[PDB]
Amino acid sequence: QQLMMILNSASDQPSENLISYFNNCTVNPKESILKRVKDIGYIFKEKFAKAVGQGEIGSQRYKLGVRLYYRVMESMLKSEEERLSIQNFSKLLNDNIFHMSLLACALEVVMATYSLSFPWILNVLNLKAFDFYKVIESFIKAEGNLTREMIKHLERCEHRIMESLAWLSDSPLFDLIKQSHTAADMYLEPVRKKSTSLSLFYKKVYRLAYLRLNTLCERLLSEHPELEHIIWTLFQHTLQNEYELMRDRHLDQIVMCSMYGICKVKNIDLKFKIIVTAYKDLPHAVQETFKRVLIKEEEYDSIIVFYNSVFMQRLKTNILQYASTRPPTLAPIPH
């Protein structure tokens, strides 16, 4: 609301102080940035009508999105001016996935405001969930006027990428796993060392998955406060070394298996029944997560079918280590 009148009263072309940044650049990005709005102007409007019948509206959504895009870019560039060398500043300003991700974020804000949302806009712009993820926090941090409900919504996009969308096949997340700080830092990362993107994503995933584990242990496993850290160590040893199981799957399916699992090898016998019912009570939870779980070659079954097939089949060598004389040393709980 307070933001939405900034946009309509403002103009659809870059500010005059934003354009300075374009011209302090060693390669002026402007015509490329500007061809970029126009080329996406076609594609967006096209796919817009392809889902909403017909009315003209597509263009107004976009032309607001664009004003937000420039307002946030201008605000983002002000901070990165001090952080980046002139070389990085100019590479940023010509990086396609950067600018695409920033605009995809602007557009999601307006579309959601006037509510076919997330991850709709990623399919429209042929933008990998994991690339787009990198712009979300510095975007929230770069628009003061985002409303609670809007901030809360971008955060839920972030949590859906961390929980599933970044774990689908052809997602660059797996390319980065095999090999082994702001949005610019992550877009400037070369595809060719450290990888700040993968690091921040994993640190964030762990805090997410761990808060979801922690509530679920306070309902069903309050009896043994000690079972939590064990279940967490299992999940964390799973995400780090058997990460291939999250492909085309959902973070919460691994949280659930790590819980029945540790109650299985300690003879606690609080079975999948209570787990799924209590999980329904997690915010935004969907029943499909446990009723519909992949095994292999597109064949889906229930969560108990997954536990006894791929999860147990991959982890028996490790899980029994927990109830033995020498159980593995504990993982740290995320800060």
Residue numbers in the entry: 383 to 437, 440 to 499, 512 to 576, 600 to 611, 642 to 784
Please quote the authors directly.
To understand how these mutations induce such effects, we crystallized M704V. While Rb’s M704V mutation alters the hydrophobic core energetic ground state by reconfiguring several buried residues, these changes must also have structural consequences that extend beyond the hydrophobic core. Additional experiments are needed to elucidate the structural mechanisms through which changes to core packing translate to E2FTD- and E7LxCxE-binding inhibition by some RbP variants.
The retinoblastoma tumor suppressor (Rb) is a multifunctional protein that primarily regulates the cell cycle but also has roles in cellular differentiation, DNA damage response, and apoptosis. Essential functions of Rb occur through its pocket domain, which is necessary for regulating binding interactions with E2F transcription factors and transcription repressors that bind via an LxCxE motif. The pocket domain is the most highly conserved region of the multidomain protein, as well as the most frequent site of mutations.
